[PDB]
Each structure stands twice: as structure tokens, then as C-alpha cells.
Amino acid sequence: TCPFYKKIPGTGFTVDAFQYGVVEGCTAYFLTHFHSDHYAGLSKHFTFPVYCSEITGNLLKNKLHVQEQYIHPLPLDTECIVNGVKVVLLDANHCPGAVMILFYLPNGTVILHTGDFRADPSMERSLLADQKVHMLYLDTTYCSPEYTFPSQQEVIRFAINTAFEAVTLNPHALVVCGTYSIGKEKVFLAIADVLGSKVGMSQEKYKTLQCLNIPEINSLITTDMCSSLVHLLPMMQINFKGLQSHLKKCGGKYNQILAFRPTGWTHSNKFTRIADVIPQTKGNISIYGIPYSEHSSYLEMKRFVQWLKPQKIIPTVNVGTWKSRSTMEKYFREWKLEAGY
Numbered sequence: 001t002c003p004f005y006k007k008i009p010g011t012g013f014t015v016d017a018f019q020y021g022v023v024e025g026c027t028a029y030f031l032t033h034f035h036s037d038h039y040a041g042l043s044k045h046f047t048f049p050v051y052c053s054e055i056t057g058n059l060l061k062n063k064l065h066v067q068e069q070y071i072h073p074l075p076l077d078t079e080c081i082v083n084g085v086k087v088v089l090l091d092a093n094h095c096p097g098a099v100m101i102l103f104y105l106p107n108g109t110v111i112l113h114t115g116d117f118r119a120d121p122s123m124e125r126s127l128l129a130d131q132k133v134h135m136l137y138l139d140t141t142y143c144s145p146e147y148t149f150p151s152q153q154e155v156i157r158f159a160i161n162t163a164f165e166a167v168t169l170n171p172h173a174l175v176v177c178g179t180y181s182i183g184k185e186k187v188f189l190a191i192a193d194v195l196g197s198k199v200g201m202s203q204e205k206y207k208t209l210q211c212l213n214i215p216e217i218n219s220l221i222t223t224d225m226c227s228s229l230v231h232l233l234p235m236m237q238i239n240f241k242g243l244q245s246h247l248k249k250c251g252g253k254y255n256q257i258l259a260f261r262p263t264g265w266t267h268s269n270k271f272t273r274i275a276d277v278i279p280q281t282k283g284n285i286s287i288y289g290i291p292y293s294e295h296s297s298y299l300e301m302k303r304f305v306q307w308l309k310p311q312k313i314i315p316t317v318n319v320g321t322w323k324s325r326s327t328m329e330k331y332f333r334e335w336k337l338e339a340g341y
């Protein structure tokens with residue numbers, strides 16, 4: 001059964017609610033982004049209207065085979081009427097195709113659902129500038145002050161400089177980057193661009209990338225692994241055994257691997273600056289964990305919420321324990337007392 005924080009009162013709508021069967025009263029199912037915890041339940045047999053971005057619609061059609069007649073793509077930054085209710089989709093600064101949804105309820109209430117997001121000051125000049133929000137359904141993944149990490153630009157600067165140094169010292173080194181979902185594509189794209197290479201990958205991953213509307217993608221990626229010195233592999237293979245096994249397959253073209261594991265936050269963020277990060281090394285294999293986040297830091301989140309000044313907040317992440325729920329409610333009250341709303 002569908003939980004309360006996935007329902008939008010006063011409408012026939014749900015958000016990210018595909019794993020509960022037929023939801024009573026639902027006339028349109030919204031999908032914020034193509035991550036498995038959110039799409040869990042969709043397939044070619046789904047027969048209700050799905051509302052989403054163009055990019056999410058490309059992924060639903062090609063990767064999950066949802067039939068075309070049930071896919072409803074909406075443009076961003078544009079007022080749209082869905083089943084008699086005005087909605088807007090906004091870029092969430094998460095993975096490709098990810099949106100926040102603004103719902104203008106028939107009684108005058110305005111609701112923002114963030115989906116998964118990485119808050120940014122640029123959001124303070126979207127269509128959110130223009131009006132009040134009564135209810136915020138908030139991505140609270142990192143809602144505690146211990147969660148710190150650098151900007152995505154600092155993290156990419158570190159990766160490009162690390163890869164370019166290593167391959168200039170050794171032209172026979174291969175670079176490998178782990179992946180397990182869409183998102184974080186700048187990691188492997190920026191490294192391949194500095195090296196003058198296409199990115200090599202499996203047919204399955206190439207298919208996924210081809211749904212993303214990335215400009216000039218045909219110039220950047222390939223399934224011909226032999227022509228490429230940046231390879232993508234499943235995240236589960238980014239370990240000494242998996243990488244050893246991979247280097248055997250490369251026909252004596254390479255004599256070293258440098259690998260990157262993009263993660264979210266890890267506790268080593270509580271001690272070590274990005275500049276000071278070192279790899280784990282065994283023999284001719286080195287592995288860097290790099291903290292490339294597609295979710296708000298605590299400070300980014302707080303800034304956004306103090307600017308928006310919502311009347312009520314409903315968290316959408318970390319809702320399963322009393323301790324998590326209590327901690328989050330405490331911070332919402334500080335923020336409100338500090339800013340005066």
C-alpha cells in the first residue's frame with residue numbers, strides 16, 4: 001500500500017509510486033527521475049498515464065519498454081494542464097532528466113515536490129521566485145550537519161588533473177570509471193575529453209547514454225573498447241580482482257590501471273580535503289574514491305529551504321526511524337526560528 005508522503009491531496013496524482021499496484025483514485029502517475037528506487041514497478045504491461053520529462057520518457061520506452069501511448073513527456077519551465085490541474089516541471093540538478101514538480105491545487109494551495117535534488121542558488125531565479133509554497137516534499141538524504149562534500153566542479157578538477165598526470169607519465173595506463181545507474185556522467189566525460197579519447201562501454205550502457213539528449217554524444221562514446229583508453233565498468237567490478245581480470249582482456253595493450261569510484265558522502269569526508277585524497281593501491285592498480293554528489297549538502301539544503309519559506313515540510317528520505325524523523329524536525333525548527341518565517 002502507497003504511503004502518505006507519495007500522495008498529492010486534492011488531486012488524482014501520485015509521485016514515484018509504481019510498486020503498490022493500482023493506487024485507488026490515481027488518474028496520473030508522475031515519475032521524477034529514472035532511478036530504480038523511484039521507478040520500482042514499471043514495465044511494458046503498465047497501462048496508466050505516466051507524466052515525466054522527455055529524457056525520462058526516452059528511458060521508459062527504450063530500457064523498460066513501456067508503450068508509447070502511456071508516456072506523457074512535458075517540457076520544462078512551462079505551465080501545463082494535467083487532468084484539470086496546472087503543473088510545472090523544473091530541473092532538479094540531480095541526474096539527466098530529473099525534475100521537481102510544482103502543483104497549483106484547485107483550492108489555492110501550492111505544493112513543491114523536489115524529487116531527488118541538489119539545491120543550488122540558481123533555483124532562486126526559476127519560476128519559484130514568483131509565488132508562495134504552502135507544502136514542500138523535500139529530499140532529505142543529507143539532512144544533518146556532518147554531511148559535507150565539495151562542489152561538483154572541484155571534484156571534476158581533481159579527477160581531470162589526476163588522470164592527465166598519470167597517463168602523461170605512463171602512456172600505457174588505462175583509466176576505468178565505475179557506474180551503476182544514470183547520473184555522474186561528467187566524471188568519465190571530462191576525463192576522456194582531457195585524454196583525447198572516446199569512452200568505451202558495453203552495448204547496454206551505450207543504449208542508456210543514447211537516451212539522454214547529451215549534445216554531440218556520438219563524438220564522445222563508443223562500443224569499440226579497443227579504440228578507447230577510458231573504459232566504463234559496472235561499479236561492482238571496481239576492486240583489485242575485477243580490475244586484474246579486466247586488464248587480462250585488453251590483449252597486452254596496457255600495463256597499469258587507474259580507476260575511479262564515484263560515491264556519495266563517505267566518513268573519510270569528515271577528515272580529508274579533496275586535494276589531500278589518496279588512492280588504494282595493489283601492484284600496477286590504483287583506485288580512487290571520489291565524493292561526487294547529486295544530492296544537496298546540509299548547507300545547500302538549509303539555504304534553499306530558508307529562501308523558499310514553506311509553511312510545512314514533508315521529508316521523503318530517512319523516514320523509517322523515529323530518531324531520523326525527530327532529528328529532521330529539530331533542524332526544520334531551527335531554520336524557521338533563525339530566518340523568522
Ligand code: NI
Pocket residue numbers: 033035094116
Ligand atoms: Ni535519485
